[PDB]
Amino acid sequence: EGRIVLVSEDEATSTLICSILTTAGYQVIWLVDGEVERLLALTPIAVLLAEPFSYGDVQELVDQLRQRCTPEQLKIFILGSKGNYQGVDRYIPLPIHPESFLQQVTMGLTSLATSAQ
């Protein structure tokens, strides 16, 4: 249960995020926005949305994920500005730091059954 999906149009931020989480033992999959079915296909333990989104609405994706997956089974995190939306466990404001991002993700993982398997 170490699969994390990151959705963002900006490849540079996504590349850094993917590399930092992978070396920590987690697997990050970068998916393009606008495709909920793709998100469902690779249903991770947590979904990372990094602003800004030009091909979709941030609230729309959050709402759609909530409708298909329960909050106890799938967690939603937003990287960018504000992040004060319902269905979001924690938000990560930019600019972000390597240690800061990892600590927030790790702490956010303390939910549901808090078990590796």
């Binding site: 590349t15 590399s19 992978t22 987690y26 970068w30 793709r38 091909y55």
Partner: protein, 106 residues
């Protein structure tokens, strides 16, 4: 465990409609998630959502697997629906990345 942020990136070009393309992600993720987790990051682009991306990478067919790191970059075109071939292709890649030395010289 000292090295960090050093991972390989695999790109998958697919179409969000065809079952063989939709399930391809599932077969690719399954093999990488268990056998090679924390080593390879996966990037997926939907050609039906942003057609110009495919044109930029000169890709007119899907599903297509593109190797970003480690370079030189490589292009893999074939049936990704079959887990057997996918595992075989990924296993070969694993051996290539595993055999890496820092300033071996000789």
């Amino acid at each position: 465990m000292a090295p960090l942020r050093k991972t390989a990136v695999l790109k998958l070009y697919v179409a969000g409609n065809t079952p063989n393309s939709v399930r391809a992600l599932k077969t690719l993720a399954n093999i990488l998630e268990k056998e090679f987790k924390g080593v390879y990051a996966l990037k997926v682009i939907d050609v039906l959502k942003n057609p110009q991306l495919a044109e930029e990478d000169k890709i007119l067919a899907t599903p297509t697997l593109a190797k970003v790191l480690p370079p030189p970059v490589r292009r893999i075109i074939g049936d990704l629906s079959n887990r057997e071939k996918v595992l075989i292709a990924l296993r070969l890649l694993a051996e290539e990345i595993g055999d890496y030395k820092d300033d071996d010289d000789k």
